[PDB]
Every structure is written in structure tokens, then in C-alpha cells.
């Protein structure tokens, strides 16, 4: 992530992903910022240990399989569900499993209106935060 | 260095003595022969030395020997480039050295 650049940056991606991806790009920079300080175990003031799980949950969010691309609205729902709340009580081992709970169990009509708007409107942000609390996350 | 070897070889082969021969920087002998063979258009070997490095060194170092009439002993100042003993010029020169006198600061 640190070495892969892009020249266009914004103005050439999804607007709804543009709302939810800058807070992922900078938070992974915070997560890589503490990896050279995780060989000792001092765990400073619940910051260098909190992002040490938050970014580790984000990098598990970014994994995916082969020959199975995801539509863009399901990606910007699935990374909405990670850089916001709804996933910090989940183990790092099973977020790849938790993402299908997020994608499938949530009503497939929020995907159509997120595709057709193009961004996350506050009318849609409310229902998206509402239906991200009703699903069952398998982490135990 | 061959001129110095000749003046020592007179005292060995004719006078019948035990001669010293101080080749100050055998590395500069190697380096001069590398320059000579580069000027004659020859392709350099490993790192940039002459292809004939072993035999150009052995042309000098094999006339320094003990014969039935005398001997030539040789105290050769050795420079080691880039602090690298596996550099092929000191690696070739060390194959001919029978001793080593390290002067320390």
C-alpha cells in the first residue's frame, strides 16, 4: 500500500468509495507506522495497540479470492463497515468471514440506491448504519 | 619490477649471494600491467584486471626463488583494494606469498 501510487488519485473513482477510503488510506499508514514498534511489547497508552488491531482488521478486510471480483457498491459497503464501527468487536481471524455476513444479510436494496446515487447520502448513511447493526457477526 | 629483478638476479646467479628484493607495492605492479593490457586492446577479466593477471604476476614471482648458486628473498609491500582480500589482485598475490608481516598502528 505504501509503494503503490496512482496519479489521478481522486476525481476518477467512486464518490461513495471516496467518502470511505481516505480514512482507510491514512489509517493503514498509521498501522504501518507501528509495525516496526511491535517486536518489544511495551504497548504504549492503548494507541499503538489499538491501531495495531484496527489496521490489522482493515488489511484483512482488503483480502479477497481469485476470479471473483466484487461490484463497487458492495466494496464501498464492506469498507464502510470497517473504517466506521461495526467490526472492532470481531477477531482478526474471521473478518474475511464477517464480510459475507455484511454483504449477504444486509438488504440488497441498499446496494441499488448506493449504486444509483454514487455517494453515501445522509438519507442512506442512516439506513446503512442501521442495517449494519442487525446482522449476525460470527466472531467468537 | 623486472629491472629490479635483473639487478638482484645478477647478485644471485653470478655473485652467489642471498639477495633481498623490495618490490614496493606489488599492487602497483599489477595495476600497471592492467593498464598496459588495457592499452593493447585486450578484454579485461574479472573485476577489471588483465586476463593475464596470474601469469603477469607469475612472471615476476617465479624468478624470485632459491637456486643452486644463491637465492632472492622478497619483501613485497601489499596493498589490498577496498579492504577486500578476495579482490583478484591480492587474491592472486597471496598465492605467491610465503609469509606475512603486518605492521599495526
Amino acid at each position: 500500500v505504501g509503494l503503490s501510487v496512482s496519479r489521478v488519485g481522486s476525481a476518477a473513482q467512486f464518490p461513495g468509495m471516496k467518502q470511505v477510503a481516505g480514512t482507510l488510506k491514512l489509517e493503514l499508514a498509521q498501522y504501518r507506522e507501528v509495525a516496526a514498534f511491535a517486536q518489544f511489547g511495551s504497548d504504549l497508552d492503548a494507541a499503538t495497540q489499538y491501531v495495531l488491531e484496527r489496521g490489522a482488521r482493515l488489511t484483512e478486510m482488503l483480502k479477497q479470492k481469485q476470479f471473483a471480483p466484487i461490484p463497487i457498491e458492495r466494496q464501498t459497503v464492506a469498507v464502510y463497515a470497517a473504517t466506521k464501527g461495526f467490526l472492532d468487536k470481531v477477531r482478526v481471524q474471521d473478518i474475511v468471514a464477517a464480510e459475507e455476513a455484511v454483504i449477504s444479510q444486509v438488504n440488497p436494496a441498499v446496494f441499488k440506491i448506493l449504486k444509483a446515487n454514487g455517494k453515501i447520502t445522509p438519507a442512506l448513511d442512516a439506513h446503512l448504519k442501521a442495517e449494519l447493526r442487525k446482522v449476525k457477526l460470527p466472531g467468537a | 619490477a623486472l629491472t629490479g629483478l635483473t639487478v638482484a638476479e645478477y647478485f644471485r646467479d653470478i655473485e652467489g649471494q642471498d639477495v633481498l628484493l623490495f618490490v614496493d607495492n606489488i599492487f602497483r605492479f599489477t595495476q600497471a600491467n592492467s593498464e598496459v593490457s588495457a592499452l593493447l586492446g585486450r578484454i579485461p577479466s574479472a573485476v577489471g584486471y588483465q586476463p593475464t593477471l596470474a601469469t603477469d604476476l607469475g612472471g615476476l614471482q617465479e624468478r624470485i626463488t632459491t637456486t643452486t648458486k644463491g637465492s632472492i628473498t622478497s619483501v613485497q609491500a601489499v596493498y589490498v583494494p577496498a579492504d577486500d582480500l578476495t579482490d583478484p589482485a591480492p587474491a592472486t598475490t597471496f598465492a605467491h606469498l610465503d609469509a606475512t608481516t603486518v605492521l599495526s598502528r
Binding site: 518489544f40 511489547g41 | 573485476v47 577489471g48 577496498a82 578476495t86 579482490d87 583478484p88
Partner: protein, 277 residues
């Protein structure tokens, strides 16, 4: 390419300088904090000459203290003590009893709250931040008689030599609860002493076991601090020889890549000139 191995050589070289500095810092700290250890060794033996040494008692509430270090380059010391802590803590637990586990030094809290979190009530750190003194051990011992246990197991590393650090367990019995009873044979073994104090023996033994807990806790953290410095002095020695072997290998790899670079750049030049000549 051939620049990464050069700066890696520089990094390993400065790490070797750093650990050779830390080795003799720990050597100076062990050499000065050794006389304090031998001076504090005197006061612990009149109590074990008086009260004795009873590790295998049957208690119902017991406080076990693991005296660890604070800084984390000790090299196999705090792990050794958290091994011995549960090794003697499972040895003396077969009665269905209560156990409070306390650690002195936050590297004990990083190692004991994952192995016995059910029994861990206290974590005491910053003890070696300037020096250990008897009033500090007295305050820690008062926090230990905040609970009212029947015994006290104290786990520490005795500074035997600059290379050997024997991990010991020292036991202190509560006065009215086990101290008079573990001396009973054909009457009592403490009745030969004529008490010349103010109040009755149930308070003389109370004062004496509070004093004895404080004294062995002072000597515990003092012996453990000297062995922590003396084991850091050996761990940093191993670190310098490891970062010297690594530097000696990586310099040979750099010299090989250096010679290979000069040869392949010259072969590129000759191949480009022979196509034109």
C-alpha cells in the same frame, strides 16, 4: 540494489556499537549494585535462623510474588521466573485454596496476566527507576498485608555470580495463622525464646513477620536487580557477537556483489564496443 546492503551493513554496525555500549553500561550498573546486594544479604538470615524455612506448608490464602525486571533486554530472566512461579504455584495448590499473584516489575505484568489472570490482583512497577530502598519494600509489603493471606511465596533470582542467577522461593508464614503451628513439635520450638516485648507474642510475631516480609522483599528486588543487570551484560555480549558475525557475513556478500557489479558493467561496455569495433 547494491545500496541496500551498504545501508544494512551500516545499520548492523551501529546496532553492534549500541549493544557494546549497553553491555558495559550494564557492567557498571552490576558493579555498583553488587555491594548493596551483599549488604542486604545479612538481614534475611536472622529470620530464617529464627523462623526457619517452610515452603511446603498447607495454606488457604497465599500471596505469591514474582520479582521481575522493568526493562526488557534481560535475556531469559523474567521468562525463567514466570516458569518457576507457576511451577511452584501448581506444586502448592492441591488443597482447594485461595491464591493472589503479585508481580514486581511490569514485564511481570506482561507475562502473568496471560498465564494466571484469574488470580492476579496487583502489579507493581517503576521500582528500580532510581533505586530500591527499604521504605519502598515496606510500602509494597503493606500492600501485601492488605490482603490477609496465610503465607507469602517470593520468587526472585539470587545473584549467585555474574553468570549464575539461581531462582529462589522464599516463604513467610502469617503469625497467628501458621507461624506458631509450623513450629509445634513436642510442645513448641518458639517457647525457648523469652519474649521481652510490650504486648503478647501474637503481636511480637505479627511485627516480626511483617518485618520479615519487608526484609525478604527488599532483598528480593535488590538481588533480582543485580541479576537483571548481570544477565543484560551477557545478553548484550551475545548481541555484539551476533551483530559482528552478521556484519562479517554481510561484508563478504557486499564484496561479492561489488566485484560482480564491476565485472558486469565492464562486460556491458566491452559488448557495446565490440559491436562497433
Amino acid at each position: 540494489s547494491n545500496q541496500a546492503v551498504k545501508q544494512r551493513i551500516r545499520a548492523i554496525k551501529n546496532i553492534g556499537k549500541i549493544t557494546k555500549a549497553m553491555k558495559m553500561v550494564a557492567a557498571s550498573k552490576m558493579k555498583n549494585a553488587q555491594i548493596a546486594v551483599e549488604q542486604s544479604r545479612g538481614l534475611v538470615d536472622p529470620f530464617v535462623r529464627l523462623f526457619g524455612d517452610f515452603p511446603a506448608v498447607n495454606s488457604n490464602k497465599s500471596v505469591v510474588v514474582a520479582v521481575t525486571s522493568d526493562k526488557g533486554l534481560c535475556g531469559g530472566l523474567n521468562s525463567n521466573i514466570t516458569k518457576y512461579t507457576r511451577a511452584t504455584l501448581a506444586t502448592t495448590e492441591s488443597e482447594g485454596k485461595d491464591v493472589v499473584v503479585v508481580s514486581i516489575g511490569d514485564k511481570g505484568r506482561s507475562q502473568l496476566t496471560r498465564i494466571e489472570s484469574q488470580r492476579y490482583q496487583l502489579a507493581i512497577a517503576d521500582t528500580y527507576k532510581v533505586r530500591v530502598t527499604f521504605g519502598q519494600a515496606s510500602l509494597i509489603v503493606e500492600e501485601l498485608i492488605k490482603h490477609n493471606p496465610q503465607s507469602y511465596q517470593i520468587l526472585f533470582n539470587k545473584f549467585r555470580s555474574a553468570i549464575s542467577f539461581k531462582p529462589t522461593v522464599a516463604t513467610i508464614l502469617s503469625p497467628d495463622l501458621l507461624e506458631k503451628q509450623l513450629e509445634d513439635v513436642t510442645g513448641n520450638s518458639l517457647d525457648a525464646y523469652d519474649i521481652e516485648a510490650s504486648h503478647e507474642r501474637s503481636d511480637v510475631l505479627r511485627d516480626l513477620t511483617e518485618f520479615h516480609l519487608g526484609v525478604t522483599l527488599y532483598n528480593a528486588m535488590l538481588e533480582n536487580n543485580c541479576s537483571e543487570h548481570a544477565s543484560r551484560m551477557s545478553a548484550m555480549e551475545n548481541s555484539t557477537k551476533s551483530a559482528g558475525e552478521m556484519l562479517g557475513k554481510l561484508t563478504l556478500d557486499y564484496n561479492r556483489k561489488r566485484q560482480a557489479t564491476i565485472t558486469t558493467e565492464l562486460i556491458e561496455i566491452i559488448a557495446g564496443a565490440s559491436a562497433l569495433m
